[PDB]
Amino acid sequence: VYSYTEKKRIRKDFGKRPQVLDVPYLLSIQLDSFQKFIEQDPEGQYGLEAAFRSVFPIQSYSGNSELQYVSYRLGEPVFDVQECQIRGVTYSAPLRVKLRLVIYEREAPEGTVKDIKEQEVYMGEIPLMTDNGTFVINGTERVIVSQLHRSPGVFFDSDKGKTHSSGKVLYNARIIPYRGSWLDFEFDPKDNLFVRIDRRRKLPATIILRALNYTTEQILDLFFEKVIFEIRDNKLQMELVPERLRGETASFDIEANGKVYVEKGRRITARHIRQLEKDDVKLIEVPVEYIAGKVVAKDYIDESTGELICAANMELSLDLLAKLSQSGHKRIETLFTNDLDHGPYISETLRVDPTNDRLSALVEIYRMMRPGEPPTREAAESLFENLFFSEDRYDLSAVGRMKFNRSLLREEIEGSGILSKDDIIDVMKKLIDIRNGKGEVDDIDHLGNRRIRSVGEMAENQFRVGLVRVERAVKERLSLGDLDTLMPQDMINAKPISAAVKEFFGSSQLSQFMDQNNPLSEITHKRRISALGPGGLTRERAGFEVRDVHPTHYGRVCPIETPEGPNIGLINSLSVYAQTNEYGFLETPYRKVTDGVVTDEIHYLSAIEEGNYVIAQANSNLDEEGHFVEDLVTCRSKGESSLFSRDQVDYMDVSTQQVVSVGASLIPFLEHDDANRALMGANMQRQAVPTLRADKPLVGTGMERAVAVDSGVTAVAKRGGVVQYVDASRIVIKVNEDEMYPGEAGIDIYNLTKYTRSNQNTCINQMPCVSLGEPVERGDVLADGPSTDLGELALGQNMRVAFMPWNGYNFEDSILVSERVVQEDRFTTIHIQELACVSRDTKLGPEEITADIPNVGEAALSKLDESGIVYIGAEVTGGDILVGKVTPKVKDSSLRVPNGVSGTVIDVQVFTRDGVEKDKRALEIEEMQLKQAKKDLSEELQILEAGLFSRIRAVLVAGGVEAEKLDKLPRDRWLELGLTDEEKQNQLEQLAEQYDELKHEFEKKLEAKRRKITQGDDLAPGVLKIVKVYLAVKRRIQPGDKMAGRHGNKGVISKINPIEDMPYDENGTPVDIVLNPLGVPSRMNIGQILETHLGMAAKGIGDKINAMLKQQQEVAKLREFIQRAYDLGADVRQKVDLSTFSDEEVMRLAENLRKGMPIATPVFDGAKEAEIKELLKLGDLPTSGQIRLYDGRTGEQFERPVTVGYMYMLKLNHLVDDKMHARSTGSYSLVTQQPLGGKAQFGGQRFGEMEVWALEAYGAAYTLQEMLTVKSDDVNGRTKMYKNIVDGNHQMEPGMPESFNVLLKEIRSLGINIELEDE
C-alpha cells in the first residue's frame, strides 16, 4: 500500500534482497550531538551542567566566601533565521545563569552570614543550530565537520624496522589522556627501559619509579621474583620451583633422592619437569660457581656491627661469599632470570640510575622539564605533584578510564580520572610482558581506537576553557573581597567567554564555510569526518598507514568516497547506517541469528566487538523462515573472509547498502565500475548545479527520496490534512481533526524561500507541487526545492546519447552537443551575485552617495533614480553604474558592474548607522517593507481567524445548533448563541480566549517588528552606510563548460551543432549528445553502458505509453499494460496491485509517466543483463540495444550498429566565463614592481621556473630576456616599451630588474656587503 502522494509517480524496482530495516535519519550526528549539548539535564552527564559542576563551587582563600552554582537557562533569540541572514549579525541566544555567593563568619567553623542571588546573570550568547544542522555566524551558513582522532588511553607499539638496521624490534607504550601531558615508555637497543614526558628528552624509568616514594628492594620485590639460597654445612641448599628451569639448560649436575636426573650438557625436557614435579623437593643441592652468576636482591648488613655487606643491584663474588659466610645468614634472596622468559631489564636500568632518592629524583625531573634553574625543593615537589594528579591540569576521560582498564584486563570501568602508582606499575608490567613475547601489540588503524567527537564535544571543551579563564580573576577579586557590599555580576565578565566561543566558531580548522550548491552536497558536507584540526594531525605528517583503509572500516566508513589530491584517507565520509556509540565509537547494525533462524531483531555492534563473532554477507538466499538455503556460506570473521558451515554463524548483514555513503549510493550500477572512476564520479556528482528544471533521473537507486526528505531544502508538512490555499509564495493547510489539538486548533502555513542566494552564488528556490484541494499525509513533500522533483533528488537531466566517433569533435573526451538542447533551455541555470559598496567618513572628509557625479554620461545616469541607487529591474551590463559614491577632493568611487557580466538587478538592500539622515530611497524601502510585513502578519491573523470561526461552526453543529441565527448574524457575535454548558461550550470559550490572545500577541509582535525595522542597526566602526545589490545572470551553455555523467566520464562540450547534423535513427528522432566510444575500455567504467541500455528500455516503455494515450485509448488497456510493465522481472520485493486504483487514480499515473518510466536499483543488488533484455523485449526495440543510424551530412548508413540510449548527465560549475581571463597592463604590486596575482584582482599569469627552463631549452634568448625584464620588472623600460609600441616601433631596451635591486638591498641589510664591480 502506498501514500496518495507516492501514487503520483510510483517507481519500478528491481532488487531481491528484502530490506528489513529502513533508512535512518541522515543528520543524527549533528542534531543529536547538539541537542545533547543544550538541555536541562540533571546529574551532570555531559552538558553545560557537566562543565559547571566541574568548575564550581569556587571557594575563597578560606575567606568563608563560596561562589556556588544554582541553575542556568537559555532565553530566546532577539532575531530569527530569516532576518538574521538578511542583516548579518549572528544567530545566538542569551545565556542566563543563577549564581550565589555565600559568606560564613570568620573565627569559627561554617557559621553562615549571608547569601545573595543575582538571578540569571548574563554571560554572553552562544549560537544555536537550525533544524538542518547549520550554524549562522556572520550572515554566513557555516558547518562544523566532525573530527576523528586517537582515543585517549594507552597503546603498545612496535616501532619495527628502523631499529638501527640490527634486525631487532623495539617496543614502546604511550599513555595519552584527554586533557594534560602525555607519558611514554620505550626501550633502547641495549635493553634499557626509559621514560619520557611530552617528547622532551630521555630518562631511565626507574627515575619515576623511585620518584613515587619507593626503595630499591621495594621495586625489585615488586617486579622480579624471589629465589632463595640457604646456607648449610655444605651444598648450599636452594629452593626451586621446577618449571623455573623449563627453558634454560642447567650446566651443573642435578640429582634427587640420590638419583641423578641432569648432568652437564643436559637440557631440561618436558619429561624431566614432569618427573621432577612428581618428586617435588625445593631444598636441593647446588654447586658454588653457578650461584656466582647472580645478583643480590635485598640489602644485607653485618651481624652485629650492621655495616653494609652489599647493596642490592650487585653481582656475587668471592669476597661477598666470604663476608656472607662469616655472617652465615641462612637466607639469600636473589632474582630469577631467563632470556627466553624473564629479563633483568629493570635491574639493568637500576644500574644506569644517576640518583638514589626521591629528592634528587624530582630535582633531575625539573631540570629536564624547565631548563636552567636552581630548583626549590617544595617547588619541584608541587610541580611533579601537579603533573599527574591535578584535578585540573590533568585529566583522563571516563572514556579514558574505560578503554584503559579494558586494555589492562582489569574488572571494572569506573573510578579516578587521574592516575595511580598501581596503574603506572601495571602499565610497565604489561610492557615487560610483551617484551617477553606474550601479549600483542595493537594496530592504531583499527577503528576500535579512533573516536568521533562532534560539535557537542567541541563547544563543551571550549566553553570549559573559557570558564577556567574567568575563574582566575574571579578568585582574585574574591580573595580580595569587601564586606558583603558587592554583587556577582560586578565580579564576573562575559567578555572572555564570548571571546573564546566566537573565536572558535568563526575561525577554526574545523568550522568551515558550507558548500551549498547542491542538496546532496549539503547533506554530505554535514556527515563528513576529518582527521585534521586541533588535537589531531597534519596534512603532511602521515604516510601510507593511517590513510589506508583498515579492514574494519567496513560498514562504518565509506571506502570509495574521498577527495583525491593532497589529503586522502583523511576526509572519510561516515557511512549510511553508522551510529555514534554511547561512548563515541562507530557502531553498525546487524541481524540477530538464533539457532537456525534469522530474527529481524536489529542489534548494534562496535568495532572490537565485531572481532569476536562471525558475520554472514548480505547476498545470501534463504527459505522464508530464516533458513540459509545452503549449508556452507561465505562469511567474515577477523579481517578474513572464508566459507563456513551453517551453525557457526553469529550475525547477518542488514542490507546490501551498508558499505557505501550517500555520496556514492546513488551511482547506479556501481557494482560494475572500478573504484577509481567510482570515486571520481561520486565527487563530480557532489559538484552539480541546480538547473532551471528538475527531471527525475530515469535510472535511480531508491535513496533519492530519502535524501530529498532529509535535507532541509524542501518543505515537509508536519501534519496530515487537506490543501486549502496554494500560492507561489505560500501554502496553507487545514488539518485533520483526529490529529488536532483542542486549543488554537487552527491550521498551518508554510512560507517558501523564493529566489535567493547560496554560498556558491547559485539560485536557491522553491516551488509548490500540489494542486488546490488535495489530501496530504503527515510527513510528505509539498515544496520541491532546487533540483528536486515530486519528492526525489534530481541534479542534471537525461539526454538521448549515442556512442560513436564523429569527425574528431570528440577527440579526447570532448562531448558534442546538439542545438536542440541549448534551444530548449535544459541546461540554462541561474546565478546570483552580491555586490557591496560601503561608504565611510575618513580623512579629508566624508563620502557621499549623491546622484550627481563629475564627468560622466547623462546617458549612463539615465538608469538612476533621483536618490542615486538604481531602480529594481534594470538590465545592466559591464561598465554600467549602480551606485554613485564620491570622495572629497571630489573624485569618483562609484560601484560598477564587474567586467563582462550581464544580468538584471532583482533586489536592493540599504543599511545606515543610526544618527544619520535616512535619505529618500531608504525611506521608500523602509515603508515598503513595513507595508509588506504588516500585510503579512495581518493576513496570518486573518485567515487564521477564518479557520477558527470555521471550527466554531463545526462545533455549533452539535447541541445548540441554530442554522439561521448562525449563518446570518455577525460571526463575532457568537458569545451568546443558544447552547448547553457542556465541555463543548467550554471549548467554545477556549476558542474565544485564543481569539483574544491572538489579537493581543499580534498587537505586540506588530509593534516590536515595527521597532526592529525602524532602528538603525550597528556596523563596523568607521562607516556610515552600506549598499547591497543583487544581480542575476542567466548563463546558457556554450563551448567549454564541463559536463559529466555519473561515472567519472568527464567531458568538455566543444561544438554546438545544428539539428541537421546530428546522426538520426531510422524513425526520425535526432540524438542529442555524442560521446566517444574510445573512452570506455581504458577507464574501466563499463557501468555507464549498461546504464544507457536500461535507460533506453525505460524511454521505450515511455514512447509506447505516450502513443497509447495520444490515441485516447480506454483505461482498461492502460491498466493491463502498466500492470504488465511492473509485474515483469524474475523476483522482486516490489508488488503493485494496480487492480486497486480509481480511474482518476490511474490516468494521472499515465500522464506522469509519459516522459519515461523511472527505474530503481539498489547498489549491489540491481538488475542483470537478461532482465534488461526481457524488459526491452516488452518494448519494441532490438535485444542487442544497438540500432542502425544515418548521417545527416550524407543521409547514408553508418556501417555497424551503434549504441544509443539515455544517459543522465550533469553540468558542473566550472564555467568558462569565469575561467577565461586576460590582462594587458593593469596595476603593479607595491613591494616589487611586479604584476599582481589572480582573476578577482585584475592580475596576470605566472611564468614559472619550469617555463624558464623551457625557453633556455630552445635556443630562445630574446624571448626570455623580454619575459624577464620588459614585460615585468623595470618601471622605466616598461613604460618606454609601451610608448614605442603605440608609436609602431617594435624594440626594447633592457634596464635592470628592480626585484634584483631589492634582493641586493635586503642582503645589504644583513651584515653582508654585496656590491657591483666595474671593469
Partner DNA sequence: CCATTCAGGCATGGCTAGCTGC
Partner DNA sequence: GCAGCTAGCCATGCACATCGCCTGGAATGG
Peptide bond into 559 cis (omega under 30): no
- Which residue has 590533568 as its cell numbers? 394
According to CB under 8 A, which residues from 490 to 519 bind another protein? none
CA distance 1 to 4: 10
618 binds another protein (CB under 8 A): yes
Length of the chain: 1319
**DSSP-derived 3-state class of residue 1057:** strand
Which of these ranges, 53-61, 312-320, 1227-1235, 1254-1262, lies near RNA under the rule CB under 7 A?
Answer: 1227-1235
537 binds DNA (CB under 7 A): yes
CA distance 687 to 338: 64
CB 574 within 8 A of CB 529: yes
According to CB under 7 A, which residues from 226 to 285 bind DNA? none
CA distance 369 to 390: 17
Query: Among 94, 584, 775, 805, which residue interacts with another protein (rule: CB under 8 A)?
Result: 805
1249 binds DNA (CB under 7 A): yes
Which of these ranges, 399-407, 543-551, 676-684, 874-882, lies near DNA under the rule CB under 7 A?
Answer: 543-551
Q: And the C-alpha cell for 243?
A: 618449571
Closer of 528 and 636 to RNA (Cβ): 528
1215 binds RNA (CB under 7 A): no
Binding partner of 537, given another protein, DNA, RNA, none, CB within 5-8 angstroms per partner class: DNA
According to CB under 7 A, which residues from 560 to 599 bind RNA? 563-565, 567, 571
1203 binds another protein (CB under 8 A): yes
Q: And the C-alpha cell for 1317?
A: 664591480
Which residues share a beta bridge with 101? 67, 116
CA distance 1144 to 343: 88
Which residues share a beta bridge with 883? 895
Q: And the C-alpha cell for 559?
A: 571506502
CB 252 within 8 A of CB 264: yes
- In the complex, what is the shortest distance from the CB of residue 681 to RNA, in angstroms, rounded to a whole number? 11
The single-letter DSSP state of residue 509 is: S
- In the complex, what is the shortest distance from the CB of residue 1295 to RNA, in angstroms, rounded to a whole number? 22
CB 830 within 8 A of CB 763: yes
CA distance 1266 to 265: 88
Closer of 773 and 1237 to RNA (Cβ): 1237
In Å, the largest CA–CA distance within the chain is 130
Query: Among 164, 264, 278, 1135, which residue interacts with DNA (rule: CB under 7 A)?
Result: 164
CA distance 26 to 467: 34
584 binds DNA (CB under 7 A): no
Closer of 567 and 1134 to RNA (Cβ): 567
CA distance 710 to 232: 86
Residue 825: which residues within 8 A CB-CB, separation 6 or more?
A: 692, 1036
Closer of 1135 and 1200 to another protein (Cβ): 1200
CA distance 533 to 537: 7
Closer of 443 and 936 to another protein (Cβ): 443
Which of these ranges, 314-322, 348-356, 939-947, 1226-1234, lies near RNA under the rule CB under 7 A?
Answer: 1226-1234
515 binds RNA (CB under 7 A): yes
513 binds RNA (CB under 7 A): yes
- Binding-site size for another protein (CB under 8 A) equals 149
CA distance 1303 to 1232: 10
Q: After which residues is the chain broken (C to N over 2.5 A)?
A: 889
CA distance 140 to 79: 15
Closer of 572 and 655 to RNA (Cβ): 572
Binding partner of 188, given another protein, RNA, DNA, none, CB within 5-8 angstroms per partner class: DNA
Binding partner of 539, given RNA, DNA, another protein, none, CB within 5-8 angstroms per partner class: RNA
- Alpha helices, DSSP H, located in 68-156: 81-87
Conformational region of residue 1158, where left means phi above 0, alpha means psi within -120 to 50, and beta covers everything else: beta
CA distance 640 to 549: 14
Query: Among 543, 857, 915, 970, which residue interacts with DNA (rule: CB under 7 A)?
Result: 543
Closer of 656 and 788 to another protein (Cβ): 656
State the binding string over 308-327 for DNA (x if CB under 7 A, else -).
Answer: --------------------
- In the complex, what is the shortest distance from the CB of residue 513 to RNA, in angstroms, rounded to a whole number? 6
Residue 410: which residues within 8 A CB-CB, separation 6 or more?
A: none
- Alpha helices, DSSP H, located in 786-856: 819-823
According to CB under 8 A, which residues from 1068 to 1087 bind another protein? 1076-1078, 1080-1082, 1084, 1086
1244 binds another protein (CB under 8 A): yes
CB 901 within 8 A of CB 1030: no
Write b or e for each residue in 148-187: b if 16 or more Cβ atoms lie within 10 A of its Cβ, otherwise e. Answer: bbbbbbbbbeeeeeeeeeeeeebbbbbbbbbbbeebbbbb
CA distance 470 to 473: 6
The single-letter DSSP state of residue 1042 is: B
State the binding string over 85-124 for DNA (x if CB under 7 A, else -).
Answer: ----------------------------------------
CA distance 1036 to 903: 12
Closer of 402 and 654 to another protein (Cβ): 654
- In the complex, what is the shortest distance from the CB of residue 686 to RNA, in angstroms, rounded to a whole number? 8
Which of these ranges, 137-145, 868-876, 926-934, 1271-1279, lies near another protein under the rule CB under 8 A?
Answer: 1271-1279
Burial (CB count <10 Å: 0-12, 13-18, 19+), residue 1063: buried
1240 binds DNA (CB under 7 A): yes
- In the complex, what is the shortest distance from the CB of residue 795 to another protein, in angstroms, rounded to a whole number? 18
1217 binds another protein (CB under 8 A): yes
509 binds RNA (CB under 7 A): yes
Q: And the C-alpha cell for 847?
A: 563620502
Which residues share a beta bridge with 23? none
Query: Among 643, 859, 1231, 1250, which residue interacts with RNA (rule: CB under 7 A)?
Result: 1231
Closer of 148 and 492 to RNA (Cβ): 148
- In the complex, what is the shortest distance from the CB of residue 148 to RNA, in angstroms, rounded to a whole number? 13
According to CB under 8 A, which residues from 1161 to 1200 bind another protein? 1164, 1166, 1168-1169, 1184-1186, 1189, 1191, 1196, 1198-1200
- Binding-site size for DNA (CB under 7 A) equals 40
Instruction: State the Rg of the chain over Cα.
Output: 41
According to CB under 7 A, which residues from 986 to 1045 bind DNA? 1021
538 binds DNA (CB under 7 A): yes
532 binds RNA (CB under 7 A): yes
According to CB under 7 A, which residues from 416 to 475 bind DNA? 444
DSSP labels for 751-773?
Answer: E---SEE-SSSBEE--EE---SS
Closer of 435 and 1034 to another protein (Cβ): 1034
Closest to 796 in 3D by CA, of 646, 684, 719, 903: 684
- In the complex, what is the shortest distance from the CB of residue 1301 to another protein, in angstroms, rounded to a whole number? 11
Query: Among 22, 131, 199, 854, which residue interacts with DNA (rule: CB under 7 A)?
Result: 199
Query: Among 342, 885, 1083, 1211, which residue interacts with RNA (rule: CB under 7 A)?
Result: 1083
- Write the single-letter amino acid at 972: D
Which residues would be at the binding site for DNA (CB under 7 A)? Answer: 137-138, 140, 150, 162, 164, 181-182, 188-190, 198-199, 202, 444, 499, 506-507, 513, 537-538, 540-543, 545-546, 1021, 1218, 1221, 1237-1240, 1243, 1245-1246, 1248-1250
Residues forming the site for RNA (CB under 7 A): 509, 512-513, 515, 530, 532, 539, 563-565, 567, 571, 676, 683, 687, 1050, 1082-1083, 1214, 1229-1231, 1236, 1241
